[PDB]
Amino acid sequence: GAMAPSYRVKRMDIAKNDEECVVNAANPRGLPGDGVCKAVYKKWPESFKNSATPVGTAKTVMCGTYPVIHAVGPNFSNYTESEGDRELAAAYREVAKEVTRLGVNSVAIPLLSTGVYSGGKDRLTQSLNHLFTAMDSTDADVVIYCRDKEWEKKISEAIQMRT
Ligand SMILES: OCc1cccc2c1OCCO2
Ligand SMILES: OCc1cccc2c1OCCO2
Ligand SMILES: [Cl-]
Ligand SMILES: [Cl-]
Ligand SMILES: [Cl-]
């Protein structure tokens, strides 16, 4: 575990993370995809061997000795708000189990279902709160990766509020 487990946020490509493992915002079929998933495919293509897994689950595949945790958030274009919320919560709980099993001291994580799976809604708070519910009981350093400057400020504020 980390000496003083923390949350941090960085605005940069998650493929250039400084953590001991990465969470991919994966699709259920283990395809290269777009956004975070395509950056992860470019950086760790070996991690997409038998990475297909259902919505609401996480499957880890090693790239050398570096773990890639494929986490499948719901596409809110297809799920009801109620069922999508349940699957999004579940995906993060499976990420917490994998992070724990791997024995890493740190993990790089994107906000699941906030891009092309968002169904055109802002889900920063929804996705971040499910991330916290899952990861609060873990002792890994968590570093959240985002693209947008306004999201960086809102994520930083949400972390500092609980402190
Ligand atoms: O530009 C900042 C930035 C932030 C997050 C992800 C990015 C990125 O740049 C292009 C590659 O992907
Ligand atoms: O455009 C989305 C995207 C693409 C590539 C890497 C990213 C990322 O967003 C979160 C931070 O890491
Ligand atoms: Cl970058
Ligand atoms: Cl997404
Ligand atoms: Cl973002």
Side-chain angles (χ1 to χ4, degrees), residues 42-79:
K42 283 180 181 155
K43 183 59 64 176
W44 305 283
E46 300 91 338
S47 76
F48 288 69
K49 195 184 200 177
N50 289 313
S51 63
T53 195
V55 172
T57 75
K59 183 168 198 191
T60 302
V61 182
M62 290 298 188
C63 177
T65 69
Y66 189 79
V68 178
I69 308 174
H70 300 274
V72 185
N75 176 6
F76 279 96
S77 290
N78 294 332
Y79 285 88

PDB file of all heavy atoms in Angstrom, residues 42-79:
ATOM      1  N   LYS A  42      -2.680   1.792 -28.378  1.00  0.00           N
ATOM      2  CA  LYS A  42      -1.402   2.246 -28.996  1.00  0.00           C
ATOM      3  C   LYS A  42      -0.238   1.939 -28.041  1.00  0.00           C
ATOM      4  O   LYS A  42       0.808   1.428 -28.502  1.00  0.00           O
ATOM      5  CB  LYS A  42      -1.470   3.741 -29.332  1.00  0.00           C
ATOM      6  CG  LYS A  42      -2.275   4.066 -30.587  1.00  0.00           C
ATOM      7  CD  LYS A  42      -2.351   5.546 -30.921  1.00  0.00           C
ATOM      8  CE  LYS A  42      -3.185   5.814 -32.157  1.00  0.00           C
ATOM      9  NZ  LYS A  42      -3.747   7.183 -32.161  1.00  0.00           N
ATOM     10  N   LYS A  43      -0.439   2.182 -26.747  1.00  0.00           N
ATOM     11  CA  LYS A  43       0.644   2.082 -25.736  1.00  0.00           C
ATOM     12  C   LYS A  43       0.872   0.633 -25.293  1.00  0.00           C
ATOM     13  O   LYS A  43       2.059   0.261 -25.090  1.00  0.00           O
ATOM     14  CB  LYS A  43       0.354   3.016 -24.549  1.00  0.00           C
ATOM     15  CG  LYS A  43       1.455   3.043 -23.488  1.00  0.00           C
ATOM     16  CD  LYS A  43       2.800   3.476 -23.993  1.00  0.00           C
ATOM     17  CE  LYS A  43       2.831   4.906 -24.498  1.00  0.00           C
ATOM     18  NZ  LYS A  43       4.198   5.334 -24.903  1.00  0.00           N
ATOM     19  N   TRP A  44      -0.196  -0.140 -25.082  1.00  0.00           N
ATOM     20  CA  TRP A  44      -0.165  -1.502 -24.509  1.00  0.00           C
ATOM     21  C   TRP A  44      -0.963  -2.481 -25.369  1.00  0.00           C
ATOM     22  O   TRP A  44      -1.894  -3.125 -24.876  1.00  0.00           O
ATOM     23  CB  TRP A  44      -0.648  -1.471 -23.043  1.00  0.00           C
ATOM     24  CG  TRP A  44       0.068  -0.522 -22.112  1.00  0.00           C
ATOM     25  CD1 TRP A  44       1.304  -0.710 -21.549  1.00  0.00           C
ATOM     26  CD2 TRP A  44      -0.411   0.732 -21.575  1.00  0.00           C
ATOM     27  NE1 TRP A  44       1.629   0.332 -20.730  1.00  0.00           N
ATOM     28  CE2 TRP A  44       0.597   1.237 -20.725  1.00  0.00           C
ATOM     29  CE3 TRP A  44      -1.584   1.471 -21.707  1.00  0.00           C
ATOM     30  CZ2 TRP A  44       0.460   2.432 -20.020  1.00  0.00           C
ATOM     31  CZ3 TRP A  44      -1.696   2.688 -21.061  1.00  0.00           C
ATOM     32  CH2 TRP A  44      -0.712   3.132 -20.174  1.00  0.00           C
ATOM     33  N   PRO A  45      -0.692  -2.637 -26.689  1.00  0.00           N
ATOM     34  CA  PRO A  45      -1.549  -3.468 -27.542  1.00  0.00           C
ATOM     35  C   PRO A  45      -1.604  -4.935 -27.115  1.00  0.00           C
ATOM     36  O   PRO A  45      -2.648  -5.559 -27.237  1.00  0.00           O
ATOM     37  CB  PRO A  45      -0.935  -3.252 -28.941  1.00  0.00           C
ATOM     38  CG  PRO A  45       0.507  -2.894 -28.669  1.00  0.00           C
ATOM     39  CD  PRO A  45       0.410  -2.002 -27.448  1.00  0.00           C
ATOM     40  N   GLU A  46      -0.533  -5.425 -26.478  1.00  0.00           N
ATOM     41  CA  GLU A  46      -0.458  -6.819 -25.994  1.00  0.00           C
ATOM     42  C   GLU A  46      -1.524  -7.084 -24.919  1.00  0.00           C
ATOM     43  O   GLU A  46      -1.890  -8.239 -24.733  1.00  0.00           O
ATOM     44  CB  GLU A  46       0.932  -7.180 -25.463  1.00  0.00           C
ATOM     45  CG  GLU A  46       2.035  -7.040 -26.514  1.00  0.00           C
ATOM     46  CD  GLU A  46       2.696  -5.674 -26.534  1.00  0.00           C
ATOM     47  OE1 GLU A  46       2.069  -4.682 -26.052  1.00  0.00           O
ATOM     48  OE2 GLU A  46       3.857  -5.572 -27.033  1.00  0.00           O
ATOM     49  N   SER A  47      -1.997  -6.034 -24.236  1.00  0.00           N
ATOM     50  CA  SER A  47      -2.991  -6.141 -23.134  1.00  0.00           C
ATOM     51  C   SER A  47      -4.400  -6.408 -23.682  1.00  0.00           C
ATOM     52  O   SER A  47      -5.298  -6.639 -22.866  1.00  0.00           O
ATOM     53  CB  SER A  47      -2.977  -4.925 -22.229  1.00  0.00           C
ATOM     54  OG  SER A  47      -3.616  -3.812 -22.823  1.00  0.00           O
ATOM     55  N   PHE A  48      -4.592  -6.396 -25.002  1.00  0.00           N
ATOM     56  CA  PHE A  48      -5.934  -6.618 -25.610  1.00  0.00           C
ATOM     57  C   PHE A  48      -6.112  -8.078 -26.033  1.00  0.00           C
ATOM     58  O   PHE A  48      -7.190  -8.408 -26.546  1.00  0.00           O
ATOM     59  CB  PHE A  48      -6.188  -5.637 -26.739  1.00  0.00           C
ATOM     60  CG  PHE A  48      -6.437  -4.223 -26.291  1.00  0.00           C
ATOM     61  CD1 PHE A  48      -5.425  -3.432 -25.733  1.00  0.00           C
ATOM     62  CD2 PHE A  48      -7.713  -3.691 -26.383  1.00  0.00           C
ATOM     63  CE1 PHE A  48      -5.694  -2.129 -25.331  1.00  0.00           C
ATOM     64  CE2 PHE A  48      -7.964  -2.388 -26.000  1.00  0.00           C
ATOM     65  CZ  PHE A  48      -6.962  -1.621 -25.440  1.00  0.00           C
ATOM     66  N   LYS A  49      -5.150  -8.942 -25.736  1.00  0.00           N
ATOM     67  CA  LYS A  49      -5.369 -10.412 -25.856  1.00  0.00           C
ATOM     68  C   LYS A  49      -6.439 -10.911 -24.880  1.00  0.00           C
ATOM     69  O   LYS A  49      -6.194 -10.931 -23.645  1.00  0.00           O
ATOM     70  CB  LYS A  49      -4.077 -11.190 -25.610  1.00  0.00           C
ATOM     71  CG  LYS A  49      -4.156 -12.640 -26.063  1.00  0.00           C
ATOM     72  CD  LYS A  49      -2.912 -13.447 -25.740  1.00  0.00           C
ATOM     73  CE  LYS A  49      -2.810 -14.696 -26.592  1.00  0.00           C
ATOM     74  NZ  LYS A  49      -1.555 -15.430 -26.300  1.00  0.00           N
ATOM     75  N   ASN A  50      -7.597 -11.346 -25.394  1.00  0.00           N
ATOM     76  CA  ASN A  50      -8.681 -11.909 -24.549  1.00  0.00           C
ATOM     77  C   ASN A  50      -9.060 -10.900 -23.457  1.00  0.00           C
ATOM     78  O   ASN A  50      -9.277 -11.292 -22.296  1.00  0.00           O
ATOM     79  CB  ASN A  50      -8.277 -13.248 -23.924  1.00  0.00           C
ATOM     80  CG  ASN A  50      -8.212 -14.335 -24.977  1.00  0.00           C
ATOM     81  OD1 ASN A  50      -9.119 -14.473 -25.791  1.00  0.00           O
ATOM     82  ND2 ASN A  50      -7.121 -15.071 -25.003  1.00  0.00           N
ATOM     83  N   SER A  51      -9.183  -9.635 -23.826  1.00  0.00           N
ATOM     84  CA  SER A  51      -9.643  -8.575 -22.884  1.00  0.00           C
ATOM     85  C   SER A  51     -11.167  -8.360 -22.896  1.00  0.00           C
ATOM     86  O   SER A  51     -11.667  -7.584 -22.038  1.00  0.00           O
ATOM     87  CB  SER A  51      -8.904  -7.282 -23.156  1.00  0.00           C
ATOM     88  OG  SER A  51      -9.183  -6.780 -24.450  1.00  0.00           O
ATOM     89  N   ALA A  52     -11.927  -8.961 -23.817  1.00  0.00           N
ATOM     90  CA  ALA A  52     -13.395  -8.816 -23.864  1.00  0.00           C
ATOM     91  C   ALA A  52     -14.012  -9.238 -22.537  1.00  0.00           C
ATOM     92  O   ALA A  52     -13.577 -10.279 -21.971  1.00  0.00           O
ATOM     93  CB  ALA A  52     -13.981  -9.655 -24.972  1.00  0.00           C
ATOM     94  N   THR A  53     -14.942  -8.445 -22.017  1.00  0.00           N
ATOM     95  CA  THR A  53     -15.597  -8.659 -20.703  1.00  0.00           C
ATOM     96  C   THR A  53     -16.905  -7.873 -20.699  1.00  0.00           C
ATOM     97  O   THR A  53     -17.031  -6.878 -21.399  1.00  0.00           O
ATOM     98  CB  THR A  53     -14.608  -8.285 -19.588  1.00  0.00           C
ATOM     99  OG1 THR A  53     -15.081  -8.803 -18.352  1.00  0.00           O
ATOM    100  CG2 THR A  53     -14.368  -6.799 -19.448  1.00  0.00           C
ATOM    101  N   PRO A  54     -17.924  -8.297 -19.943  1.00  0.00           N
ATOM    102  CA  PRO A  54     -19.223  -7.642 -20.000  1.00  0.00           C
ATOM    103  C   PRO A  54     -19.261  -6.271 -19.362  1.00  0.00           C
ATOM    104  O   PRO A  54     -18.389  -5.914 -18.544  1.00  0.00           O
ATOM    105  CB  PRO A  54     -20.194  -8.583 -19.283  1.00  0.00           C
ATOM    106  CG  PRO A  54     -19.406  -9.694 -18.726  1.00  0.00           C
ATOM    107  CD  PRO A  54     -17.964  -9.538 -19.152  1.00  0.00           C
ATOM    108  N   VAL A  55     -20.358  -5.563 -19.625  1.00  0.00           N
ATOM    109  CA  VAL A  55     -20.578  -4.247 -18.991  1.00  0.00           C
ATOM    110  C   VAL A  55     -20.627  -4.470 -17.478  1.00  0.00           C
ATOM    111  O   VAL A  55     -21.227  -5.462 -17.026  1.00  0.00           O
ATOM    112  CB  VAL A  55     -21.857  -3.552 -19.525  1.00  0.00           C
ATOM    113  CG1 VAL A  55     -22.169  -2.299 -18.706  1.00  0.00           C
ATOM    114  CG2 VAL A  55     -21.690  -3.194 -21.007  1.00  0.00           C
ATOM    115  N   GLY A  56     -20.044  -3.540 -16.725  1.00  0.00           N
ATOM    116  CA  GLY A  56     -20.121  -3.581 -15.249  1.00  0.00           C
ATOM    117  C   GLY A  56     -19.010  -4.435 -14.644  1.00  0.00           C
ATOM    118  O   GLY A  56     -19.101  -4.703 -13.418  1.00  0.00           O
ATOM    119  N   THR A  57     -18.059  -4.921 -15.453  1.00  0.00           N
ATOM    120  CA  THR A  57     -16.924  -5.768 -15.002  1.00  0.00           C
ATOM    121  C   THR A  57     -15.578  -5.177 -15.390  1.00  0.00           C
ATOM    122  O   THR A  57     -15.490  -4.211 -16.185  1.00  0.00           O
ATOM    123  CB  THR A  57     -17.045  -7.202 -15.540  1.00  0.00           C
ATOM    124  OG1 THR A  57     -16.698  -7.234 -16.937  1.00  0.00           O
ATOM    125  CG2 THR A  57     -18.404  -7.813 -15.279  1.00  0.00           C
ATOM    126  N   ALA A  58     -14.522  -5.757 -14.814  1.00  0.00           N
ATOM    127  CA  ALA A  58     -13.142  -5.382 -15.128  1.00  0.00           C
ATOM    128  C   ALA A  58     -12.333  -6.654 -15.300  1.00  0.00           C
ATOM    129  O   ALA A  58     -12.554  -7.637 -14.541  1.00  0.00           O
ATOM    130  CB  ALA A  58     -12.535  -4.527 -14.035  1.00  0.00           C
ATOM    131  N   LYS A  59     -11.480  -6.660 -16.303  1.00  0.00           N
ATOM    132  CA  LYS A  59     -10.613  -7.817 -16.618  1.00  0.00           C
ATOM    133  C   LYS A  59      -9.193  -7.301 -16.799  1.00  0.00           C
ATOM    134  O   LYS A  59      -8.976  -6.403 -17.642  1.00  0.00           O
ATOM    135  CB  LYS A  59     -11.120  -8.506 -17.876  1.00  0.00           C
ATOM    136  CG  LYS A  59     -10.336  -9.763 -18.229  1.00  0.00           C
ATOM    137  CD  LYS A  59     -11.029 -10.572 -19.299  1.00  0.00           C
ATOM    138  CE  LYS A  59     -10.502 -11.983 -19.329  1.00  0.00           C
ATOM    139  NZ  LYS A  59     -10.967 -12.726 -20.525  1.00  0.00           N
ATOM    140  N   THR A  60      -8.224  -7.868 -16.070  1.00  0.00           N
ATOM    141  CA  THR A  60      -6.821  -7.406 -16.137  1.00  0.00           C
ATOM    142  C   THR A  60      -6.048  -8.317 -17.085  1.00  0.00           C
ATOM    143  O   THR A  60      -6.203  -9.573 -17.002  1.00  0.00           O
ATOM    144  CB  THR A  60      -6.156  -7.431 -14.760  1.00  0.00           C
ATOM    145  OG1 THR A  60      -6.923  -6.602 -13.896  1.00  0.00           O
ATOM    146  CG2 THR A  60      -4.711  -6.973 -14.832  1.00  0.00           C
ATOM    147  N   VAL A  61      -5.290  -7.716 -17.967  1.00  0.00           N
ATOM    148  CA  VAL A  61      -4.332  -8.389 -18.862  1.00  0.00           C
ATOM    149  C   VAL A  61      -2.992  -7.677 -18.745  1.00  0.00           C
ATOM    150  O   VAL A  61      -2.919  -6.472 -18.862  1.00  0.00           O
ATOM    151  CB  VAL A  61      -4.825  -8.422 -20.322  1.00  0.00           C
ATOM    152  CG1 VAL A  61      -3.837  -9.167 -21.218  1.00  0.00           C
ATOM    153  CG2 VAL A  61      -6.212  -9.011 -20.413  1.00  0.00           C
ATOM    154  N   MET A  62      -1.931  -8.454 -18.530  1.00  0.00           N
ATOM    155  CA  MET A  62      -0.552  -7.931 -18.394  1.00  0.00           C
ATOM    156  C   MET A  62      -0.013  -7.515 -19.763  1.00  0.00           C
ATOM    157  O   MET A  62      -0.279  -8.227 -20.750  1.00  0.00           O
ATOM    158  CB  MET A  62       0.385  -8.984 -17.793  1.00  0.00           C
ATOM    159  CG  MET A  62       0.127  -9.270 -16.344  1.00  0.00           C
ATOM    160  SD  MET A  62       0.371  -7.807 -15.312  1.00  0.00           S
ATOM    161  CE  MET A  62       0.223  -8.517 -13.671  1.00  0.00           C
ATOM    162  N   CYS A  63       0.733  -6.409 -19.793  1.00  0.00           N
ATOM    163  CA  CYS A  63       1.587  -6.001 -20.936  1.00  0.00           C
ATOM    164  C   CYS A  63       3.010  -6.047 -20.379  1.00  0.00           C
ATOM    165  O   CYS A  63       3.349  -5.172 -19.557  1.00  0.00           O
ATOM    166  CB  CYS A  63       1.231  -4.619 -21.445  1.00  0.00           C
ATOM    167  SG  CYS A  63       2.321  -4.055 -22.782  1.00  0.00           S
ATOM    168  N   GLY A  64       3.729  -7.138 -20.625  1.00  0.00           N
ATOM    169  CA  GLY A  64       4.981  -7.409 -19.895  1.00  0.00           C
ATOM    170  C   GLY A  64       4.659  -7.692 -18.457  1.00  0.00           C
ATOM    171  O   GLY A  64       3.890  -8.635 -18.183  1.00  0.00           O
ATOM    172  N   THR A  65       5.120  -6.884 -17.509  1.00  0.00           N
ATOM    173  CA  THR A  65       4.683  -6.992 -16.100  1.00  0.00           C
ATOM    174  C   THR A  65       3.801  -5.811 -15.709  1.00  0.00           C
ATOM    175  O   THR A  65       3.476  -5.699 -14.510  1.00  0.00           O
ATOM    176  CB  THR A  65       5.833  -7.025 -15.084  1.00  0.00           C
ATOM    177  OG1 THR A  65       6.478  -5.744 -15.038  1.00  0.00           O
ATOM    178  CG2 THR A  65       6.815  -8.116 -15.423  1.00  0.00           C
ATOM    179  N   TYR A  66       3.384  -4.990 -16.669  1.00  0.00           N
ATOM    180  CA  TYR A  66       2.547  -3.793 -16.366  1.00  0.00           C
ATOM    181  C   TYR A  66       1.073  -4.159 -16.502  1.00  0.00           C
ATOM    182  O   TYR A  66       0.637  -4.489 -17.601  1.00  0.00           O
ATOM    183  CB  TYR A  66       2.906  -2.645 -17.300  1.00  0.00           C
ATOM    184  CG  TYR A  66       2.263  -1.325 -16.930  1.00  0.00           C
ATOM    185  CD1 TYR A  66       2.771  -0.532 -15.915  1.00  0.00           C
ATOM    186  CD2 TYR A  66       1.095  -0.905 -17.543  1.00  0.00           C
ATOM    187  CE1 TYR A  66       2.183   0.682 -15.551  1.00  0.00           C
ATOM    188  CE2 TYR A  66       0.497   0.318 -17.198  1.00  0.00           C
ATOM    189  CZ  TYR A  66       1.024   1.099 -16.178  1.00  0.00           C
ATOM    190  OH  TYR A  66       0.451   2.303 -15.845  1.00  0.00           O
ATOM    191  N   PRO A  67       0.256  -4.078 -15.434  1.00  0.00           N
ATOM    192  CA  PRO A  67      -1.155  -4.480 -15.518  1.00  0.00           C
ATOM    193  C   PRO A  67      -2.062  -3.413 -16.160  1.00  0.00           C
ATOM    194  O   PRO A  67      -1.975  -2.250 -15.794  1.00  0.00           O
ATOM    195  CB  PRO A  67      -1.591  -4.682 -14.061  1.00  0.00           C
ATOM    196  CG  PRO A  67      -0.321  -4.611 -13.250  1.00  0.00           C
ATOM    197  CD  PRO A  67       0.657  -3.779 -14.052  1.00  0.00           C
ATOM    198  N   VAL A  68      -2.874  -3.854 -17.130  1.00  0.00           N
ATOM    199  CA  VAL A  68      -3.936  -3.034 -17.757  1.00  0.00           C
ATOM    200  C   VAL A  68      -5.277  -3.610 -17.297  1.00  0.00           C
ATOM    201  O   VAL A  68      -5.630  -4.786 -17.635  1.00  0.00           O
ATOM    202  CB  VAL A  68      -3.815  -3.006 -19.293  1.00  0.00           C
ATOM    203  CG1 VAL A  68      -4.949  -2.192 -19.893  1.00  0.00           C
ATOM    204  CG2 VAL A  68      -2.466  -2.479 -19.793  1.00  0.00           C
ATOM    205  N   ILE A  69      -6.032  -2.828 -16.518  1.00  0.00           N
ATOM    206  CA  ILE A  69      -7.340  -3.227 -15.972  1.00  0.00           C
ATOM    207  C   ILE A  69      -8.377  -2.675 -16.969  1.00  0.00           C
ATOM    208  O   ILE A  69      -8.643  -1.461 -16.946  1.00  0.00           O
ATOM    209  CB  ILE A  69      -7.567  -2.693 -14.544  1.00  0.00           C
ATOM    210  CG1 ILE A  69      -6.401  -3.060 -13.617  1.00  0.00           C
ATOM    211  CG2 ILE A  69      -8.882  -3.197 -14.030  1.00  0.00           C
ATOM    212  CD1 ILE A  69      -6.500  -2.427 -12.238  1.00  0.00           C
ATOM    213  N   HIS A  70      -8.953  -3.545 -17.784  1.00  0.00           N
ATOM    214  CA  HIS A  70     -10.041  -3.170 -18.731  1.00  0.00           C
ATOM    215  C   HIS A  70     -11.367  -3.068 -17.993  1.00  0.00           C
ATOM    216  O   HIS A  70     -11.948  -4.127 -17.677  1.00  0.00           O
ATOM    217  CB  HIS A  70     -10.077  -4.165 -19.896  1.00  0.00           C
ATOM    218  CG  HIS A  70      -8.812  -4.215 -20.684  1.00  0.00           C
ATOM    219  ND1 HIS A  70      -8.542  -3.350 -21.743  1.00  0.00           N
ATOM    220  CD2 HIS A  70      -7.754  -5.048 -20.599  1.00  0.00           C
ATOM    221  CE1 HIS A  70      -7.353  -3.640 -22.229  1.00  0.00           C
ATOM    222  NE2 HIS A  70      -6.851  -4.690 -21.559  1.00  0.00           N
ATOM    223  N   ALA A  71     -11.874  -1.860 -17.757  1.00  0.00           N
ATOM    224  CA  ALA A  71     -13.124  -1.612 -17.008  1.00  0.00           C
ATOM    225  C   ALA A  71     -14.194  -1.153 -18.017  1.00  0.00           C
ATOM    226  O   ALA A  71     -13.947  -0.166 -18.705  1.00  0.00           O
ATOM    227  CB  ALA A  71     -12.880  -0.537 -15.966  1.00  0.00           C
ATOM    228  N   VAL A  72     -15.307  -1.871 -18.070  1.00  0.00           N
ATOM    229  CA  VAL A  72     -16.407  -1.595 -19.059  1.00  0.00           C
ATOM    230  C   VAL A  72     -17.583  -0.869 -18.396  1.00  0.00           C
ATOM    231  O   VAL A  72     -18.404  -1.491 -17.721  1.00  0.00           O
ATOM    232  CB  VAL A  72     -16.812  -2.903 -19.750  1.00  0.00           C
ATOM    233  CG1 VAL A  72     -17.851  -2.636 -20.840  1.00  0.00           C
ATOM    234  CG2 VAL A  72     -15.569  -3.529 -20.352  1.00  0.00           C
ATOM    235  N   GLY A  73     -17.637   0.439 -18.598  1.00  0.00           N
ATOM    236  CA  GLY A  73     -18.753   1.285 -18.172  1.00  0.00           C
ATOM    237  C   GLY A  73     -19.904   1.135 -19.164  1.00  0.00           C
ATOM    238  O   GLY A  73     -19.677   0.700 -20.293  1.00  0.00           O
ATOM    239  N   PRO A  74     -21.133   1.390 -18.714  1.00  0.00           N
ATOM    240  CA  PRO A  74     -22.301   1.369 -19.588  1.00  0.00           C
ATOM    241  C   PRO A  74     -22.295   2.537 -20.583  1.00  0.00           C
ATOM    242  O   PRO A  74     -21.895   3.705 -20.268  1.00  0.00           O
ATOM    243  CB  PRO A  74     -23.448   1.504 -18.604  1.00  0.00           C
ATOM    244  CG  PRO A  74     -22.871   2.388 -17.497  1.00  0.00           C
ATOM    245  CD  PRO A  74     -21.499   1.778 -17.340  1.00  0.00           C
ATOM    246  N   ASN A  75     -22.828   2.251 -21.787  1.00  0.00           N
ATOM    247  CA  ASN A  75     -23.101   3.331 -22.773  1.00  0.00           C
ATOM    248  C   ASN A  75     -24.514   3.852 -22.477  1.00  0.00           C
ATOM    249  O   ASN A  75     -25.462   3.131 -22.709  1.00  0.00           O
ATOM    250  CB  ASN A  75     -22.953   2.793 -24.204  1.00  0.00           C
ATOM    251  CG  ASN A  75     -23.311   3.821 -25.250  1.00  0.00           C
ATOM    252  OD1 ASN A  75     -23.567   4.981 -24.915  1.00  0.00           O
ATOM    253  ND2 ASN A  75     -23.253   3.417 -26.502  1.00  0.00           N
ATOM    254  N   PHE A  76     -24.639   5.064 -21.973  1.00  0.00           N
ATOM    255  CA  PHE A  76     -25.924   5.686 -21.549  1.00  0.00           C
ATOM    256  C   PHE A  76     -26.825   5.969 -22.772  1.00  0.00           C
ATOM    257  O   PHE A  76     -27.997   6.264 -22.539  1.00  0.00           O
ATOM    258  CB  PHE A  76     -25.668   6.915 -20.676  1.00  0.00           C
ATOM    259  CG  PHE A  76     -25.362   6.550 -19.243  1.00  0.00           C
ATOM    260  CD1 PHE A  76     -24.061   6.452 -18.793  1.00  0.00           C
ATOM    261  CD2 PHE A  76     -26.372   6.302 -18.339  1.00  0.00           C
ATOM    262  CE1 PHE A  76     -23.783   6.148 -17.467  1.00  0.00           C
ATOM    263  CE2 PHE A  76     -26.099   5.972 -17.014  1.00  0.00           C
ATOM    264  CZ  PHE A  76     -24.792   5.871 -16.589  1.00  0.00           C
ATOM    265  N   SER A  77     -26.318   5.811 -23.983  1.00  0.00           N
ATOM    266  CA  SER A  77     -27.177   5.771 -25.204  1.00  0.00           C
ATOM    267  C   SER A  77     -28.106   4.545 -25.185  1.00  0.00           C
ATOM    268  O   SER A  77     -29.209   4.595 -25.776  1.00  0.00           O
ATOM    269  CB  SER A  77     -26.336   5.828 -26.442  1.00  0.00           C
ATOM    270  OG  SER A  77     -25.747   7.121 -26.602  1.00  0.00           O
ATOM    271  N   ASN A  78     -27.738   3.473 -24.490  1.00  0.00           N
ATOM    272  CA  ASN A  78     -28.430   2.171 -24.580  1.00  0.00           C
ATOM    273  C   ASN A  78     -29.111   1.809 -23.281  1.00  0.00           C
ATOM    274  O   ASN A  78     -30.138   1.123 -23.335  1.00  0.00           O
ATOM    275  CB  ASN A  78     -27.455   1.074 -24.980  1.00  0.00           C
ATOM    276  CG  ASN A  78     -26.959   1.314 -26.380  1.00  0.00           C
ATOM    277  OD1 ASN A  78     -27.669   1.926 -27.180  1.00  0.00           O
ATOM    278  ND2 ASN A  78     -25.765   0.849 -26.658  1.00  0.00           N
ATOM    279  N   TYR A  79     -28.499   2.159 -22.152  1.00  0.00           N
ATOM    280  CA  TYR A  79     -29.031   1.862 -20.801  1.00  0.00           C
ATOM    281  C   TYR A  79     -29.979   2.988 -20.373  1.00  0.00           C
ATOM    282  O   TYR A  79     -29.715   4.167 -20.693  1.00  0.00           O
ATOM    283  CB  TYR A  79     -27.879   1.696 -19.800  1.00  0.00           C
ATOM    284  CG  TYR A  79     -27.132   0.391 -19.930  1.00  0.00           C
ATOM    285  CD1 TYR A  79     -26.057   0.245 -20.783  1.00  0.00           C
ATOM    286  CD2 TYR A  79     -27.507  -0.716 -19.184  1.00  0.00           C
ATOM    287  CE1 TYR A  79     -25.403  -0.964 -20.925  1.00  0.00           C
ATOM    288  CE2 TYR A  79     -26.850  -1.930 -19.297  1.00  0.00           C
ATOM    289  CZ  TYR A  79     -25.804  -2.060 -20.190  1.00  0.00           C
ATOM    290  OH  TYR A  79     -25.167  -3.253 -20.340  1.00  0.00           O
TER     291      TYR A  79
END
